[PDB]
């Protein structure tokens with residue numbers, strides 16, 4: 001109740017900024033998350049005993065992979081924290097509860113492999129869930145952890161409020177499937193430009209929430225250049241491991257996953273910032289103007305990758 005989490009001065013200030021890096025001290029990340037829930041949601045949203053037990057169960061069910069790990073989870077929750085805090089009056093009490101939990105849980109039990117590799121491997125999960133394979137798994141993992149004795153952080157919601165939050169979390173996690181982003185952002189673009197966008201329309205809020213999830217998921221591209229560059233190594237470590245596994249099945253991987261084409265990474269980054277990241281943050285800034293700092297950092301990082309290609313680093 002009267003127990004607040006407090007951060008050291010530099011963190012307390014820097015955590016409010018979009019480009020905050022959560023640091024290399026794993027043992028501080030749970031406290032960083034609880035801090036963000038308390039400021040974003042209230043010290044009443046969750047029983048602290050249950051929240052702490054939920055957080056530690058979520059951490060245990062993230063694997064020791066180079067990128068899709070517990071640090072990614074907390075990083076993606078922080079970006080959502082920053083969006084929510086810069087957009088106070090736009091989101092409901094339920095949405096603010098659900099979305100930080102959704103971000104913490106969005107890659108639960110990730111093995112570091114794409115939906116593609118699961119399908120070509122003929123992994124059991126690709127028979128259970130024929131599209132958004134890993135994302136349906138991440139939501140299933142979230143529901144299972146919530147149902148562990150003492151882990152139901154939502155228990156003090158009403159029956160209807162509980163159903164609404166689980167549906168917010170389900171849609172939020174499914175939307176982190178990048179295959180679904182292109183269509184989602186096209187529809188948001190058409191709607192904002194014809195002016196038909198209506199945030200009282202539930203189907204419209206769903207689309208906007210989904211774009212916020214893509215924005216948060218991709219947020220390594222919105223950090224200081226050294227964070228962005230050092231995260232890129234972790235991202236490619238997984239992609240290249242996946243390409244190795246493709247070659248073991250007798251399939252030449254796409255260049256993205258071929259460690260033989262290390263050289264082409266800078267040009268692949270331009271394509272990705274131009275095809276995915278920049279349009280994601282542009283449409284987000286059109287719908288929620290206070291998220292402009294993400295667009296600006298993303299553009300700065302595109303310019304840095306341009307500088308690497310020109311051999312100036």
Ligand SMILES: Cn1ncc(C(=O)N2CCC2)c1C(=O)Nc1cn(-c2ccc3ccccc3n2)cn1
Nearest residue numbers: 178218220235255256261262264265268269271272
């Ligand atoms: C930075 N970032 N953050 C998230 C993701 C992502 O997609 N994720 C799904 C899991 C996270 C990325 C990313 O790098 N995507 C990407 C990189 N390329 C390319 C394309 C052609 C290439 C040719 C040669 C070498 C490298 C290449 N790379 C295409 N898409």
Ligand SMILES: [Mg+2]
Nearest residue numbers: 106107134176
């Ligand atoms: Mg994912």
Ligand SMILES: [Zn+2]
Nearest residue numbers: 072106107217
């Ligand atoms: Zn993710």
